[PDB]
């Protein structure tokens, strides 16, 4: 087991062959940030995977094809929408930029990764030390599974 | 407080002819002109309940007046509403195309009145239950002026400005309630939209006034 | 349960946050609904309670009297007019107003005679109720008991209080239903039983909203 794999974190599995998180001595002449990055990437991966599966199931159009029909005519769940591509992209950039800009303005990395608060409706977090950690491991594991699944979907999209 | 609208020197509803206002109307509340000739606020509890009723009515009627005026103006300018007139907008749901916000077939496009009524009942019941008894957006706040999450811009931090804005709110609300009573009566009598009535009055003020309908409800 | 500070209220979970202080809960049907503040003075509260109970009893009787003839006519009783709001014109009929159709019952013809008799009788009865007369004097204004409780069904005070709660609740329901009767007769123009039958025939299509543009202003 690697020494820098100190444990006490949900994603501890002893997988770091290249020593990316391994501290190194320095001469003049961090794990929290990487965990946050994996968390965010995995969250978006599960969101994308669920959305692609639901879109394939309900309307039947390919996820790779989505966007071409939308540009010709906007429609969600078979119901038309009165939005052009310009208004769509403007609204998207404004809202996402606002959410991002509020997201990164947190001096505390623990709250940066795990804001809780209003984003947790049920009092599931509380102060538990085992069940909360177990569900946190569950989130990180499903995040990894969704990331690899979406990478497989992207690979299969090419050359097909 | 020490301002033109509070204390024994506040303006009163009959000018110099008002005399002395009633004793219980000491002038410590916004919009206190000392007009309680009927004597319905002798009991302080009843006075407080009437104040709450007046404020809620004022806010609702301000919203109602704005929402009665705006769609008719837009429809007159050219926007293709289903029914621009305020007292006819409710019947749009019975049309074949259903209710269309701003006249667009992709905006709302409601079809069933029952769903609208049910969702409105649920949402408004929750809203008013939260208003009466503290909910997620504040628990221990004032009944009429909760502030906090309902004053995001911080326009009521200064107590003097707070009192001034309270007076302005109550005056605008009373004006709006008077105008909404006018809306109801004009709709019953004339049968046209308020903007149509205004345009008709402006076209010929000498003859296009209320007295033209005076002989409308005479018995025969 | 019922009387007591921990009593059911008119807004459920949203009511205990704000209830009138003068509504302690010592009277039947106290759900703590006085948002308008009309019963701050205890004397006015007592008068309003009296008015409410009288309306409740009258509306119970009115609801039964509105429903029974129409149902009986549906069962096949030859009534002059089943609908309650057209039942008063039977006195102007050529054959007169006959109880249960049969011309040997009552067979009233004149409206003035019955109106005068009712005026005299009800005047005496209501004067006795207001002041006190042969049927007891100085009794409870709302629940005299005694000769007005021949069966003695409310001798036990707790049972008496529970029956009072049942009375006021049934009365509030009856008054609400009678207001519904008035509004439906004004709008639909048919009897309440006809309204129920029509609604049961096509619940989604025919309802109140169908008569929504009934009173739209003309011109
Ligand atoms: C000095 C003269 C002066 C006079 C005469 C009045 C008079 C009035 N002020 Mg006051 N004010 C005056 C000075 C001032 N007021 C105010 C500020 C206010 C405010 C904020 C308010 C008033 C209001 C009132 C009204 C209160 C009484 C009422 O309800 O009338 C009711 C009776 C009438 C109006 C007379 C009846 C009208 C008509 C002659 C008869 C109708 C004929 C119809 C054809 C018949 C009906 C048809 C039927 C069949 C349907 C009354 C019209 C209140 C108000 O506007 O209520 C309406 C009010 O809110 N005043 C200020 C600023 C400080 C004043 C400064 O001097
Ligand atoms: C929880 C969700 C919630 C929502 C969506 C609303 C929304 C509303 N409240 Mg409400 N409230 C809510 C909870 C609560 N309110 C209140 C106390 C009040 C009061 C006293 C009033 C409202 C009013 C309103 C309405 C006008 C909003 C406004 O003033 O814009 C301003 C802000 C824009 C950003 C609107 C229906 C007003 C109203 O009903 O007027 C018609 C009003 O006077 N609310 C309390 C107790 C503190 C709540 C507890 O959670
Ligand atoms: C927790 C949810 C809850 C809510 C929201 C309510 C709310 C209510 N309860 Mg309560 N209750 C609730 C739980 C409970 N209640 C009770 C026991 C009682 C009793 C005994 C009574 C009430 C009554 C009431 C009503 C008080 C009247 C009112 O406030 O008018 C505000 C409400 C409205 C104005 C409704 C408006 C409906 C719609 C949105 C508007 C209609 C639009 C029209 C088309 C407009 C058309 C215009 C026309 C006229 C031209 C109100 C609907 C009283 C009642 O029934 O009076 C009617 C009553 O007697 N409740 C119990 C047992 C412990 C409860 C348990 O949780
Ligand atoms: C970040 C993730 C993500 C992204 C980028 C999209 C993006 C899109 N989705 Mg997908 N979707 C997602 C998550 C996502 N969705 C999830 C989580 C679900 C499950 C509820 C769905 C279920 C779904 C369906 C069922 C459909 C779409 C459709 C669409 C397209 C137009 C509607 C729209 O933008 O939503 C507008 C949302 C307003 C609230 C657009 C390309 C529609 C389409 O035609 O594309 C295939 C469509 O029919 N999505
Ligand atoms: C399906 C897997 C899964 C699991 C087991 C959990 C479980 C949990 N999440 Mg995660 N979460 C998920 C999906 C999941 N969530 C998704 C799809 C999103 C994107 C919307 C999030 C976004 C999210 C945030 C932003 C937060 C949680 C929080 C929490 C905790 C409350 C709990 C451990 C909160 C937490 O850590 O508690 C303090 C918290 O702040 N989650
Ligand atoms: C439902 C609305 C409503 C309510 C509850 C109140 C309540 C109150 N007002 Mg406000 N007021 C209103 C509408 C209302 N007012 C309107 C529309 C105006 C402008 C005309 C005013 C102008 C006004 C002034 C200038 C003053 C008050 C004052 C008061 C207080 C004492 C009077 C009283 O006992 O009210 C009891 C009220 C009712 C029981 C409501 C009865 C409504 C009836 C049924 C309507 C029909 C009558 C009406 C005249 C119809 C014609 C309308 C229009 C043509 C005149 C009390 C808190 C005085 C005060 O102390 O301020 C704090 C004061 O100085 N009010
Ligand atoms: C008490 C206040 C009140 C009430 C009860 C109403 C009630 C109503 N309004 Mg009015 N309105 C009000 C205030 C009010 N309005 C105010 C203050 C304004 C000014 C902003 C308007 C402006 C307005 C317009 C311009 C229109 C209405 C319309 C309507 C009707 C349907 C609205 C709807 O679908 O709701 C649900 C509405 C939403 C959930 C908002 C959706 C916003 C869209 C999706 C995005 C914005 C556009 C891009 C209904 C009769 C419509 C109608 O049919 O009139 C004839 C209509 O076209 N209202
Ligand atoms: C004329 C009939 C009448 C009378 C005199 C009263 C009187 C009273 N009721 Mg009762 N009540 C009634 C009808 C009546 N109520 C009806 C129909 C219901 C069912 C909705 C109730 C349900 C009810 C509850 C649940 C409670 C009371 C309570 C009270 C007391 C305090 C409230 C108050 O000040 O009322 C004063 C009443 C008036 C001044 C009458 C004025 C009526 C005006 C004209 C409006 C009527 C029309 C109106 C628009 C109808 C809207 C609703 C409609 C859909 C039916 C008081 C003794 C509370 C209490 O303390 O119990 C002892 C209490 O907890 N009542
Ligand atoms: C002061 C005093 C004193 C002495 O002592 C005694 C006496 C005289 C009694 C008193 C007086 C009083 C008065 C005057 C009152 C009045 C009131 C009013 C008018 C109200 C209104 C009030 C009014 C109001 C609320 C209104 C409201 C409105 C609304 C909601 C509306 C809504 C809407 C809209 C938007 C439009 C659409 O399409 C539809 C609808 C949905 C329909
Ligand atoms: C609670 C509260 C609180 C806050 O604070 C304020 C407020 C809101 C104001 C309040 C409320 C109130 C209310 C709701 C009330 C209502 C009432 C009613 C409905 C009554 C009725 C009532 C009703 C009634 C009596 C009724 C009655 C009836 C009758 C007699 C009838 C009779 C008859 C009959 C049999 C049939 C035939 O063929 C004819 C005749 C002979 C005609």
Swiss-Prot record, chain A:
UniProt topology in membrane? Multi-pass membrane protein
**Residues involved in chlorophyll b 4 binding:** 103
The molecular function terms in GO held by this entry are: chlorophyll binding; metal ion binding
Sites binding chlorophyll a 4 sit at 142
Q: Give the domain section of the comments.
A: The N-terminus of the protein extends into the stroma where it is involved with adhesion of granal membranes and post-translational modifications; both are believed to mediate the distribution of excitation energy between photosystems I and II.
* Subunit and partners: The LHC complex consists of chlorophyll a-b binding proteins.
* Protein name, entry field: Chlorophyll a-b binding protein CP29
Name its species.
Chlamydomonas reinhardtii
**Which part of the entire sequence is included in the shown chain?**
59 to 259 of 280
């Amino acid at each position: 087991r690697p020494e820098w794999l100190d444990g006490s974190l949900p994603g501890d599995r002893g997988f770091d062959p290249l020593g990316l998180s391994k501290p190194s001595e320095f001469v003049v002449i961090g794990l929290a940030r990487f965990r946050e990055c994996e968390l965010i990437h995995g969250r978006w991966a599960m969101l994308a995977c669920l959305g692609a599966l639901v879109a394939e199931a309900t309307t039947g159009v390919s996820w790779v094809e989505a966007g071409k029909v939308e540009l010709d005519g906007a429609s969600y769940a078979g119901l038309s929408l009165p939005f052009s591509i310009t208004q769509l992209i403007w609204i998207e950039v404004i809202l996402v930029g606002g959410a991002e800009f509020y997201r990164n303005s947190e001096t505390n990395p623990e709250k940066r990764c795990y804001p809780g608060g209003v984003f947790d409706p049920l009092k599931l977090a509380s102060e538990d030390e085992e069940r909360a950690f177990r569900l946190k491991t569950a989130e990180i594991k499903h995040a990894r599974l969704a990331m690899v699944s979406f990478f497989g979907y992207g690979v299969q999209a090419l050359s097909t | 407080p020490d301002s033109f609208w509070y204390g024994p020197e506040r303006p009163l509803f009959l000018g110099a002819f008002t005399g002395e206002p009633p004793s219980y109307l000491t002038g410590e509340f916004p919009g206190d002109y000392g007009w309680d000739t009927a004597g319905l606020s002798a009991d302080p509890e009843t006075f407080k309940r009437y104040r709450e009723l007046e404020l809620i009515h004022a806010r609702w009627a301000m919203l109602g007046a704005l929402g009665c005026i705006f769609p008719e103006l837009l429809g007159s300018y050219g926007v293709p509403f289903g029914e621009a007139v305020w007292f006819k907008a409710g019947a749009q749901i019975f049309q074949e195309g259903g209710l269309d916000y701003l006249g667009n077939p992709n905006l709302v496009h409601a079809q069933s009145i029952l769903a609208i009524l049910g969702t409105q009942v649920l949402l408004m019941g929750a809203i008013e239950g939260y208003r009466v008894n503290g909910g997620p957006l504040g628990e221990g706040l004032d009944k009429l002026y909760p502030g906090g999450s309902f004053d995001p811009l911080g326009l009521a931090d200064d107590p003097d400005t707070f009192a001034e804005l309270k007076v302005k709110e109550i005056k605008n609300g009373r004006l709006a309630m008077f105008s909404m009573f006018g809306f109801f009566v004009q709709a019953i009598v004339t049968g046209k939209g308020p903007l149509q009535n205004l345009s008709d009055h402006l076209a010929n003020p000498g003859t296009n006034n209320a007295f033209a309908y005076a002989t409308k409800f005479t018995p025969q």
